[PDB]
Amino acid sequence: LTSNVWMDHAWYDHRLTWNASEYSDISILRLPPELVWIPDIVLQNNNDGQYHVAYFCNVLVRPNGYVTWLPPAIFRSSCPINVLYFPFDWQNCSLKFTALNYDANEITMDLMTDTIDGKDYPIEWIIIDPEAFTENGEWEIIHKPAKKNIYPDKFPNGTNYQDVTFYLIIRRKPLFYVINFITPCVLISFLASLAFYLPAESGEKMSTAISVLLAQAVFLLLTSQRLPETALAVPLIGKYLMFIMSLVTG
Amino acid sequence: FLLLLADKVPETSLSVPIIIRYLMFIMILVAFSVILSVVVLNLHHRSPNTHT
Amino acid sequence: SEHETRLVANLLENYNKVIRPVEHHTHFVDITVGLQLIQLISVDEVNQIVETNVRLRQQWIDVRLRWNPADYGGIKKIRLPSDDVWLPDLVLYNNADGDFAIVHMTKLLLDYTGKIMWTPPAIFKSYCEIIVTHFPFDQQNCTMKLGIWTYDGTKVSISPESDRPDLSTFMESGEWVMKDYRGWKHWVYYTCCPDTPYLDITYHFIMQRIPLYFVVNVI
Amino acid sequence: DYTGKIMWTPPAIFKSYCEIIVTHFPFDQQNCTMKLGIWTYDGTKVSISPESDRPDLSTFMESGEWVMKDYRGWKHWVYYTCCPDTPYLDITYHFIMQRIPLYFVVNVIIPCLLFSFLTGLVFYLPTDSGEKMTLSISVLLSLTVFLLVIVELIPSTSSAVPLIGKYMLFTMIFVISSIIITVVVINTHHRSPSTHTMPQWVRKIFIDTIPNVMFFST
Amino acid sequence: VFLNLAWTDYRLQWDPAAYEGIKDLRIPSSDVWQPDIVLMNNNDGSFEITLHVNVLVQHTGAVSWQPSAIYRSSCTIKVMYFPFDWQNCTMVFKSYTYDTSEVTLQHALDAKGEREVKEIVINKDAFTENGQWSIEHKPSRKNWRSDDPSYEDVTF
Amino acid sequence: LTTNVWIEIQWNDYRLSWNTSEYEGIDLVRIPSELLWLPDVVLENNVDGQFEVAYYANVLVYNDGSMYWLPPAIYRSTCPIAVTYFPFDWQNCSLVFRSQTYNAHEVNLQLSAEEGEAVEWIHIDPEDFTENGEWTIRHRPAKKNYNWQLTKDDTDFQEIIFFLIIQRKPLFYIINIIAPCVLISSLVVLVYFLPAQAGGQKCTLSISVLLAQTIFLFLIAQKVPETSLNVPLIGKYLIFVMFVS
Amino acid sequence: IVCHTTATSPISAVTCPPGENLCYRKMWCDAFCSSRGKVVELGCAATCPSKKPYEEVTCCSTDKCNPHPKQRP
Numbered sequence A: 001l002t003s004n005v006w007m008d009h010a011w012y013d014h015r016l017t018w019n020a021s022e023y024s025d026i027s028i029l030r031l032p033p034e035l036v037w038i039p040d041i042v043l044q045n046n047n048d049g050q051y052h053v054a055y056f057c058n059v060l061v062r063p064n065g066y067v068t069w070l071p072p073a074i075f076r077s078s079c080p081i082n083v084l085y086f087p088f089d090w091q092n093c094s095l096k097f098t099a100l101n102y103d104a105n106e107i108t109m110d111l112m113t114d115t116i117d118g119k120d121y122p123i124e125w126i127i128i129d130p131e132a133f134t135e136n137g138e139w140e141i142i143h144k145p146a147k148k149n150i151y152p153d154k155f156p157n158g159t160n161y162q163d164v165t166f167y168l169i170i171r172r173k174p175l176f177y178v179i180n181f182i183t184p185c186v187l188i189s190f191l192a193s194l195a196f197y198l199p200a201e202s203g204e205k206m207s208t209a210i211s212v213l214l215a216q217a218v219f220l221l222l223t224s225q226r227l228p229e230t231a232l233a234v235p236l237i238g239k240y241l242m243f244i245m246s247l248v249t250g
Numbered sequence B: 001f002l003l004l005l006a007d008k009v010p011e012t013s014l015s016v017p018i019i020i021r022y023l024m025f026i027m028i029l030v031a032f033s034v035i036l037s038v039v040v041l042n043l044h045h046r047s048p049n050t051h052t
Numbered sequence C: 001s002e003h004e005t006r007l008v009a010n011l012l013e014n015y016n017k018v019i020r021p022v023e024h025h026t027h028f029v030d031i032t033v034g035l036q037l038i039q040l041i042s043v044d045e046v047n048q049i050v051e052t053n054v055r056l057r058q059q060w061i062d063v064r065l066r067w068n069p070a071d072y073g074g075i076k077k078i079r080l081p082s083d084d085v086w087l088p089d090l091v092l093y094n095n096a097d098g099d100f101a102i103v104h105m106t107k108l109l110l111d112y113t114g115k116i117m118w119t120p121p122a123i124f125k126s127y128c129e130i131i132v133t134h135f136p137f138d139q140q141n142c143t144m145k146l147g148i149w150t151y152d153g154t155k156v157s158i159s160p161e162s163d164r165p166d167l168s169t170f171m172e173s174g175e176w177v178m179k180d181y182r183g184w185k186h187w188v189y190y191t192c193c194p195d196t197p198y199l200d201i202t203y204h205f206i207m208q209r210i211p212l213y214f215v216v217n218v219i
Numbered sequence D: 001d002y003t004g005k006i007m008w009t010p011p012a013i014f015k016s017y018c019e020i021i022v023t024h025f026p027f028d029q030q031n032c033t034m035k036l037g038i039w040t041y042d043g044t045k046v047s048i049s050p051e052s053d054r055p056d057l058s059t060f061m062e063s064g065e066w067v068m069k070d071y072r073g074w075k076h077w078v079y080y081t082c083c084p085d086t087p088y089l090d091i092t093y094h095f096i097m098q099r100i101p102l103y104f105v106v107n108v109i110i111p112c113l114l115f116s117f118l119t120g121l122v123f124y125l126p127t128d129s130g131e132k133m134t135l136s137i138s139v140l141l142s143l144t145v146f147l148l149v150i151v152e153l154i155p156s157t158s159s160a161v162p163l164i165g166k167y168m169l170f171t172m173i174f175v176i177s178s179i180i181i182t183v184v185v186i187n188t189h190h191r192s193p194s195t196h197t198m199p200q201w202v203r204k205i206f207i208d209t210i211p212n213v214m215f216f217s218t
Numbered sequence E: 001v002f003l004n005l006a007w008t009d010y011r012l013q014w015d016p017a018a019y020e021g022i023k024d025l026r027i028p029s030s031d032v033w034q035p036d037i038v039l040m041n042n043n044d045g046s047f048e049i050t051l052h053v054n055v056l057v058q059h060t061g062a063v064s065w066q067p068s069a070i071y072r073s074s075c076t077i078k079v080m081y082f083p084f085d086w087q088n089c090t091m092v093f094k095s096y097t098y099d100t101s102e103v104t105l106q107h108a109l110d111a112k113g114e115r116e117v118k119e120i121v122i123n124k125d126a127f128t129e130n131g132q133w134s135i136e137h138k139p140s141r142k143n144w145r146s147d148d149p150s151y152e153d154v155t156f
Numbered sequence F: 001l002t003t004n005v006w007i008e009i010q011w012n013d014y015r016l017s018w019n020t021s022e023y024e025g026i027d028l029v030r031i032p033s034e035l036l037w038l039p040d041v042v043l044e045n046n047v048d049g050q051f052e053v054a055y056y057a058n059v060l061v062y063n064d065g066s067m068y069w070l071p072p073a074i075y076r077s078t079c080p081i082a083v084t085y086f087p088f089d090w091q092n093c094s095l096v097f098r099s100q101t102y103n104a105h106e107v108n109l110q111l112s113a114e115e116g117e118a119v120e121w122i123h124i125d126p127e128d129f130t131e132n133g134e135w136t137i138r139h140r141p142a143k144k145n146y147n148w149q150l151t152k153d154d155t156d157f158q159e160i161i162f163f164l165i166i167q168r169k170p171l172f173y174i175i176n177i178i179a180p181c182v183l184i185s186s187l188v189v190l191v192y193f194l195p196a197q198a199g200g201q202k203c204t205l206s207i208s209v210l211l212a213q214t215i216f217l218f219l220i221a222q223k224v225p226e227t228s229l230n231v232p233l234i235g236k237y238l239i240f241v242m243f244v245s
Numbered sequence G: 001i002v003c004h005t006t007a008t009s010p011i012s013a014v015t016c017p018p019g020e021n022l023c024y025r026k027m028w029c030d031a032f033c034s035s036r037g038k039v040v041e042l043g044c045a046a047t048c049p050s051k052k053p054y055e056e057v058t059c060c061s062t063d064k065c066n067p068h069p070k071q072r073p
């Protein structure tokens, strides 16, 4: 999975405090993260060797010490495919974020809170601008949860007791395949079936059927270079191809 | 099928994978099927005007 | 030159590239932004990505970087490195898979008034809504949204250098024709504060495809 | 060491330009080189000498596609018109490697052999069987799909015509000639007497001489 | 993979009673000495790790470093029973520059350290099965070279 | 276009001059380029973002302030293709060098003068140069060009251009695409000597040659550029033979 | 015969074994045609080697005909 995401950190640094009236009424400050302490919170389930954000932008500081940091990132996460119902598949792709520089007794990864009606509520979802989000042409987002995960088998001392994970349950838009893979093969196999109406006085029964099988072989070729060579399931389309190739051989 | 499989087989020459041996087996078997079908058709379309 | 050496030593002596160039923290530094399109490299109609080679012209004044030429041999321009002075964090909001900000730390031009002119290159890989409805006879409208990432219009104000990009050095693509191109400056207000607008310049390019490859190879 | 004797053995991925001779492909021998020298100094400032006459392959992993036959390293000095006492040195290591011709034999050659052998067979297929064109032109189609395979496998070099290419073009011309003579045979077979009277030389040669010149036939 | 390195630096010792009971520090890796433990059998040119997490220093001088890496290792493929094949595919690890006269390579200890772990560790909380490859074995032993007394690797 | 070039920059820095008598006759010093002022000579017509050189070699500094920098570079230039006669095409690919920092009032880019004559060409070792394999170099000129839409300022006024006019070797295509398609499409005239009756197999041969032409079209589509300004020659011929079939 | 040969470092005036008494001198400028000049090959030969379009050869029959262009015979 390739994603453009904005991480939004927030933490308090008591050392970045100041009385705004002692100075001029400076209510806020921008500081490069190469000068201040930064929690290197990294994508652990990354495929490329890219654990960090892409632009180490400035942190915003308030006189109370509240530091915010919204660095943008381009992550390449490892999310395995469930090809069973391909091309009608929905995937559950995860972005797992850890803190490998400090243990859970030194920092605590939490989810951001927000307010609506004087009540604090956590942001248990990926944030998506409903106007500025251009939907991908192949994948639709159904669910987008976010979870803080604790692993009690592990000890708090250690970097494996903590996890903030962001899940994308995305559904495929099955139109390119329906228009270029399924419909033609279905109709060509129907041709094979209809070969039984052809009289033997026409030397065209076997030609018809075996040419239909050649077309099915071409479609199998196109299909084989669309999925990973996994073995936890036979793709629905490959299932249908085997079924229909066997039926045409019959 | 050989074309299909081209982009998925290691390009090493220390051995032949059982999959390519199987495909070559089936390919040569189909070839011999062709040869023998040609022979059968030759025998079937033979006559005294051409053959004793 | 001895003069320019002395000047650059005296200009960066007490200069901090971390603080904005303002006499008072309340005021803003206006940055005149301008996009120079050079070639359209690619259009991925699947991933919905447009790849362009651009120069991001930026002008602004740094009150701390002034001098009298009479005291420096008549010098009126220098070519300081960009990592040595304060720069604005202009980010491509609609970036897809490339770099958000500028990474080519090219030298900048500095006048005696403090006026700076930085014109660094960039490969923008933007995210464009692609409409495959009349392919290959389709007309795309692809945008580059730019803004200051960590500062608000109260601290850093941007303004486009011209109503529309500069395509004077545009290499013709061979598979895309640019019909029109304009750039708009926007501001957005939020419930947090009414006196604080958040700014973004969005340059868009309306590109019509040349449908010959796909006519002779597919139709 | 305490004497100032330094030993620095860093790694490197050398992507070197090698004159590739695809003339006997896949039975091709190469002599890829790696020329090394000091860029900014000359032999009077920085001299380089080869540790040994030949590289160290004591920890060389076997490739699976190439066999290293010979490997050696030569030092060279070159003189210029600048100056008659400043030689400019280089060490050129060359590795002679023979390709293992099994992948390409099994995947590119044997199928072309089958196609050739089958093109030499439409001549045992009688014409009363309306299938000669079927067979010949389907062999041609199989060979075209295999041409796809070949272009996917073998290199797109234009330095010279390899053996794979010569054999493929020979096979293709073989199939084309097969199809042409097949058409001639079908035209003679379906040669109506109403419009074509058989010559006398044809009857003397094909009906009267060659049949007897054969013994193996029925 | 996470490498799990541990060593002792006599210089990073202190009494916690003198420092408000600080018994462990997290220190950037660039600030302490670390051995050049690298993947030798890489196919790219990336010997060293990718993510330089900060080390864990105890008041005894015990330095634990659990850095992360996307490693691309070279393994010979046995093309005889493909696709019904089983691959070995090792990962060789040693210090690029330090040798036996300088560092002694051992195996890592289990969670409750009493005995060495002579296998690759897999954490089920964090492990994505491939879908095309089943891991049947995952041992780890030290390998030497009789011709080279200065060589010692920990191969996985 | 991908090239490996050794570009030789030469200039004078009055600050790095010295008198040899004070330094035991030393007239030549090597200083790393990371320590010196360099003109930001870059490749502008690059597709990637590699404007600069690959190896920052040392700069030979002479007592008079002369600097000889011979940095090697690996440049992925941009040169549009002329498909019209593909694969019997020759391309005119350019390497445009200018300073992206300094202007003409600051630096004057010029070509080398060896023996008082200007080196208005790319230098190519005739002995230690390996011809590519698909592209043959015919011309290799170099000229100083000025963009007159700009001023003596603006940093893009002057530029040194090196050209590579290269003729393709159309042999892979000939003995893998051209000759096969030609021999295969020449078969559709053999349908005229087959009998017009069951068993003659006219349409069999014709439509199978059409099928082969379709496969060849798929093979060519994997080899031709995706530009839509002109129709190449091999695709044109494929269309012709498909219309004929 | 006494020829000048580049088969030594530094250049030497060595006598040729029996069979070669033609002192040759090849020259041609390579990728360093400018900073250094034409290459200089010298030595012994039984017959004057061939010449290509870019080379500049000069073979003799006397002693030390082929000195470096910055020297004299």
Ligand SMILES: *[C@@H]1O[C@H](CO)[C@@H](O[C@@H]2O[C@H](CO)[C@@H](O[C@@H]3O[C@H](CO[C@H]4O[C@H](CO[C@H]5O[C@H](CO)[C@@H](O)[C@H](O)[C@@H]5O[C@H]5O[C@H](CO)[C@@H](O)[C@H](O)[C@@H]5O)[C@@H](O)[C@H](O[C@H]5O[C@H](CO)[C@@H](O)[C@H](O)[C@@H]5O)[C@@H]4O)[C@@H](O)[C@H](O[C@H]4O[C@H](CO)[C@@H](O)[C@H](O)[C@@H]4O[C@H]4O[C@H](CO)[C@@H](O)[C@H](O)[C@@H]4O[C@H]4O[C@H](CO)[C@@H](O)[C@H](O)[C@@H]4O)[C@@H]3O)[C@H](O)[C@H]2NC(C)=O)[C@H](O)[C@H]1NC(C)=O
Pocket: D031, D033, D074, D075, D076, D077, D078, D079, D092, D093, D094, D096, G006, G007, G008, G009, G040, G041, G042, G043
């Ligand atoms: C694959 O591709 C490869 C690249 O594309 C390609 O590489 C080429 O291979 C050929 C053959 O293998 C190479 O040709 C050889 O090049 C040698 C190097 O020339 C360099 O150095 C010599 C000086 O040599 C002395 O010093 C060097 C370095 O220190 C030592 O390595 C040498 O052993 C030798 O040392 C002796 O002398 C020293 C004092 O000088 C002593 O200190 C020391 O103790 C030793 O006594 C220079 O002369 C050369 O300069 C000339 O060439 C350069 C350019 O190369 C010019 O610029 C320059 O102006 C000069 O013209 C060069 O710098 C040569 O040594 C070697 O020469 C022998 O062969 C040629 C013909 O082949 C004869 O003419 C010559 O007389 C030599 O014959 C003697 O040596 C051979 C074996 O080398 C014997 O068989 C022969 O009987 C004779 O023997 C006597 O002398 C021997 C010492 O050499 C001694 O051992 C014997 O016992 C006997 O007494 C030859 O020219 C070529 O360079 C390769 N090219 C590259 C780029 O690598 C490869 O072939 C390809 N493979 C395939 C399969 O395709």
Ligand SMILES: *[C@@H]1O[C@H](CO)[C@@H](O)[C@H](O)[C@H]1NC(C)=O
Pocket: A019, A020, A021, A022
């Ligand atoms: C901030 O400074 C002003 C000025 O002395 C002082 O009156 C005020 O009490 C200070 N506030 C705090 C919280 O110390």
Ligand SMILES: *[C@@H]1O[C@H](CO)[C@@H](O)[C@H](O)[C@H]1NC(C)=O
Pocket: A155, A157, E112
């Ligand atoms: C972490 O905590 C566990 C459980 O108390 C303990 O066994 C282990 O020694 C601790 N690790 C360190 C480095 O203190």
Ligand SMILES: *[C@@H]1O[C@H](CO)[C@@H](O)[C@H](O)[C@H]1NC(C)=O
Pocket: F019, F020, F021, F022
């Ligand atoms: C160079 O230095 C020497 C002193 O060693 C001096 O005598 C000579 O005049 C100097 N040359 C110049 C050109 O200044």
